[PDB]
Amino acid sequence: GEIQWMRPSKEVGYPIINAPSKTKLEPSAFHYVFEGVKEPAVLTKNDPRLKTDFEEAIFSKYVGNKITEVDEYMKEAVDHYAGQLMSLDINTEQMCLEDAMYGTDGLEALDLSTSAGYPYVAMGKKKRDILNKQTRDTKEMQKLLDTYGINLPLVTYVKDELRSKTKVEQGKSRLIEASSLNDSVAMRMAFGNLYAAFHKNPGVITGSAVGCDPDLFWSKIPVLMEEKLFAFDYTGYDASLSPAWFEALKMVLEKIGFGDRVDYIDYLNHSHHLYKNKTYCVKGGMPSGCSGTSIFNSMINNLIIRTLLLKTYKGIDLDHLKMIAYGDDVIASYPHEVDASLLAQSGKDYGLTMTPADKSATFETVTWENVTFLKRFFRADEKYPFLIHPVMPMKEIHESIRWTKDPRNTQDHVRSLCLLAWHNGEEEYNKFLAKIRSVPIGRALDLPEYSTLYRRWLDSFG
RNA sequence: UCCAGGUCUCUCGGAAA
RNA sequence: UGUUCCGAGAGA
RNA sequence: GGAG
Ligand SMILES: [Zn+2]
């Protein structure tokens, strides 16, 4: 992914967009109860704590495109992956406007509490002005689909979120591409049925974990896996992707019945963006906020691994590789050991930058003890060791409860966090609850006891 | 002075029944 | 327990 | 930037 040009919105008639310039993240009741080092991300460039140039930094992700052509290993990957997906009897029919808009089995509705993107955002129009869930009316949407059509520019925003000190300094804030309501809707008519398939079928056939509940899914995963596991991290995954990859994805899509609508895939490859007072063209790179981006980035991952395999281990039978991706996150297994430091080398030739998993500063052996998926470890229940806890480290939970975007959320916020923390076990969780309750708000809350969570976790299993 | 900040998935919560 | 609308948190 |  790489910018082709950038110039001031007003030069070509596009409006300026003003994002709010101040974060909603205040310090929380529990700010000093817990220790933590993440702070709000950098939103503007007239900002003190910046240690280097802002814009220069947020855009450095678009490093370059590297390949242009699908090679034979990519074609092989494609073939193997495509034939995997045909096993699922996936409805290849367009989804009707009503189901696209308002949901159906396997796909939730458009979010009524989010921007409608271009151009509605430059006319103070909202989704609630067009969509209505209680009548599921389509008329005004079809009318707007006639009017503006599709393939509209995306609006760029900075994600307002907690961030590492290092990254606030280096200005490594994260970018959001606001999808047009129109484009979101066209995408769901074309691929709603594929989404509903993947959402229903997380595992090793899809290689996606989208649609899973970690509390119930962590128990199915080691069954689905092979023996020796491998994993790694990606640097700038989505931006790092390049045209050949989007081409290979189209080939999979052609192969499983969605051929008449692969041009839509071109519209994620070649994209135009509104960012504040500027306007830019990007070729290569998955955009952050498009419809499907979660499904599509996983598919492309299931293609990258398979490819790098085929390149790095001649004659390798991918018929025996077991993997699950959630976008760039991945947990992968082969019956025989595979060396991530090798794949990471091949990776370069495909424009991908692969580093060792979980920030561990050298390539060593993945094992159920140190492996991670969606920021969770795997840890078997002491009583029933076939039930696997998803375990997120307190450290992460600690950072979260220190800040808030609205204090009247505090009960829910903290409740949520408990639901996560207790997998660390009764000793850590009762102590969590102690620290919480050491402040007058803490004691005001209704928090569940360790007994209740365990009892409910087990009962959820049948 | 209010509003503004994507795609999805899971879960919790509040309502209404 | 089954849905419906809304809120929130987390993950990618 | 978007309504008063
Ligand atoms: Zn262009």
Residue numbers in the entry: 1 to 462
Describing publication, verbatim:
The replication of positive-strand RNA viruses relies on virally encoded RNA-dependent RNA polymerases (RdRPs) that are capable of rapid and processive synthesis of the 7–14 kilobase viral genomes. To examine this in further detail and to validate the polymerase–RNA interactions seen in the initial poliovirus EC structures, we here present nine new coxsackievirus, rhinovirus, and poliovirus elongation complex structures at resolutions ranging from 2.1 to 2.9 Å. All the complexes feature an upstream RNA duplex that is pinched between the pinky finger and thumb domains such that the RNA exit channel is opened by ≈4 Å as compared to the polymerase alone structures. All of the complexes show the open conformation for the active site wherein the β-strands of motifs A and C are not hydrogen bonded together to fully form the RMM-fold that is commonly utilized by polymerase active sites.
Expanding on the r2 construct, the length of the upstream RNA duplex between the two ECs was shortened from 26 to 24 (r3) and 22 (r4) base pairs, and both these RNAs resulted in poliovirus EC crystals that diffracted to 2.4 Å (PV_r3) and 2.8 Å (PV_r4) resolution.
